[PDB]
């Protein structure tokens, strides 16, 4: 039997990451010379992250801890504002390192909810020593942590439990098209991704438009959509890892001011699940299957997928 799966969700919820995890787990996986192809993405990802923080400092009126840093800030734009592709040298690596390490820079970094910063900003920056190497070759995790906007509809075929799957990633924009989406009316299952860590984030261009709400609004559209009653709805409350760390310093009340529980991972996460599951009108007939995930964690996606597949077979 062939199972069709449609990944839906806002931008940066983890869709391509899950697609990548399917290749790694169910297919070949990323080869040494396949990883080399992201050597660049990794550099580009890293350069942009640091530039964003440095650029935010001004916007937020934050000062370097050391003034000799301003000379490094200037040097970053010279090396970056010269190259056209993501590269990496030893001088560049020094600049970035000294900046990363700076107190004023760390201060701006801890107020990242105020600006737009790649989630993996910190990961690449804390391993610059390693990714900066002359022969550096990205690892699977480095590839799973990259950030590439998928414009087209991506798909994958893998086999699992004598079942052949066909995953479709349409992206955020197309998840929205109320009409278009109709072309997918018979889908076996739909995996809807939500980024838990977005609760205290604003949607850039909109800057006052909370993202979790935007996702909540989209979940509502699909969930209660005529074309998917016969379609299973799986909810991946993704980024549980960054949520665990954020929740202990950024209250849920920022997202849900009516929240009265306490701000612990267990209570707050449960509050988010409920808010989503409750958007389901046909709650009588239709059941939503929720899962807390970490798309970059291959062990998690695997355990979790085994679970998803066990449900699809059952119904």
**Annotated binding-site members:** 12-17, 119-120, 144-147, 150, 169-173, 238-241, 295
Q: Of the two residues 64 and 192, which places its CB atom closer to ligand GDP in the complex?
A: 192
Q: How far is the CB of 16 from ligand GDP (least distance, A)?
A: 4
Give the residue, chosen from 3, 6, 8, 12, that forms a contact with ligand GDP under the rule CB under 6 A. 12
Catalytic residue ranges: 12, 17, 147, 169, 173
Q: How far is the CB of 314 from ligand GDP (least distance, A)?
A: 27
- Residue whose tokens read 């709400």: 213
Question: Could you give the string, one character per residue 235-264, with x where binding to ligand GDP holds by CB under 6 A and - elsewhere?
Answer: ---xx-xx----------------------
Q: Do residues 127 and 115 make contact, with C-beta atoms less than 8 angstroms apart? A: no
Under the binding rule (CB under 6 A), the answer on residue 295 touching ligand GDP is yes
Question: Could you give the string, one character per residue 83-122, with x where binding to ligand GDP holds by CB under 6 A and - elsewhere?
Answer: -----------------------------------xxx--
Under the binding rule (CB under 6 A), the answer on residue 44 touching ligand GDP is no
Q: Tell me the C-alpha distance between 81 and 55, whole Å.
A: 14
Task: Give the CA angle between residues 104, 106, 108 to the nearest 5°.
Answer: 70
Under the binding rule (CB under 6 A), the answer on residue 138 touching ligand GDP is no
Cβ atoms within 10 Å of 85's Cβ, excluding its own: 7
Cβ atoms within 10 Å of 5's Cβ, excluding its own: 23
Under the binding rule (CB under 6 A), the answer on residue 145 touching ligand GDP is yes
Cross-sheet strand order for the sheet of 164-169: 154-159, 164-169, 2-9, 189-195, 232-238, 288-292
Q: How far is the CB of 241 from ligand GDP (least distance, A)?
A: 5
Integer CA distances (angstroms), 44 to 47, 49, 50, 51, 212, in order:
5, 9, 10, 11, 27
Under the binding rule (CB under 6 A), the answer on residue 212 touching ligand GDP is no
Cα–Cα nearest to 46, from 106, 103, 95: 95
Q: Of the two residues 16 and 210, which places its CB atom closer to ligand GDP in the complex?
A: 16
Q: Tell me the C-alpha distance between 138 and 84, whole Å.
A: 20
Q: Of the two residues 122 and 163, which places its CB atom closer to ligand GDP in the complex?
A: 122
Q: Which residues sit opposite 195 in a β-bridge?
A: 238
Q: Do residues 245 and 199 make contact, with C-beta atoms less than 8 angstroms apart? A: no
Q: Which residue ranges make up the site for ligand GDP (CB under 6 A)?
A: 9, 11-17, 118-120, 144-145, 147, 150, 238-239, 241-242, 294-296
């Amino acid at each position: 039997r062939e199972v069709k799966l449609l990944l839906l969700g806002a931008v940066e919820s983890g869709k391509s990451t899950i697609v990548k995890q399917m290749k790694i787990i169910h297919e070949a996986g990323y080869s040494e010379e396949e990883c080399k192809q992201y050597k660049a993405v990794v550099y580009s990802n890293t350069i942009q992250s640091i530039i964003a923080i440095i650029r935010a400092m001004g916007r937020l009126k934050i000062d370097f801890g050391d003034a000799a840093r301003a000379d490094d800030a200037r040097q970053l734009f010279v090396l970056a504002g010269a190259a056209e592709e993501g590269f990496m040298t030893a001088e560049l690596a020094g600049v970035i390192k000294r900046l990363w390490k700076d107190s004023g820079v760390q201060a701006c970094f801890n107020r990242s909810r105020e600006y737009q910063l790649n989630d993996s900003a910190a990961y690449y920056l804390n391993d610059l020593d390693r990714i900066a190497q002359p022969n550096y070759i990205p690892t699977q995790q480095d590839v799973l942590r990259t950030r590439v906007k998928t414009t087209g509809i991506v798909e994958t075929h893998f086999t699992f439990k004598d079942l052949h799957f066909k995953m479709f990633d349409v992206g955020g924009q197309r998840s929205e098209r109320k009409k278009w989406i109709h072309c997918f009316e018979g889908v076996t299952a739909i995996i809807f991704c939500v980024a838990l860590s977005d609760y205290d984030l604003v949607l850039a261009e909109d800057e006052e438009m909370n993202r979790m709400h935007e996702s909540m609004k989209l979940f509502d559209s699909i969930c209660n959509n005529k074309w998917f009653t016969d379609t299973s709805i799986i909810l991946f409350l993704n980024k549980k890892d960054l949520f665990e760390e954020k929740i202990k310093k950024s209250p849920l009340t920022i997202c849900y001011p009516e929240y009265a529980g306490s701000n612990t991972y267990e209570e707050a996460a449960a509050y988010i699940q409920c808010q989503f599951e409750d958007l389901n009108k046909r709650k009588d007939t239709k059941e939503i299957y929720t899962h807390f995930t970490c798309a970059t964690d291959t062990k998690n996606v695997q355990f979790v997928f085994d679970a998803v597949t066990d449900v699809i077979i059952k119904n």
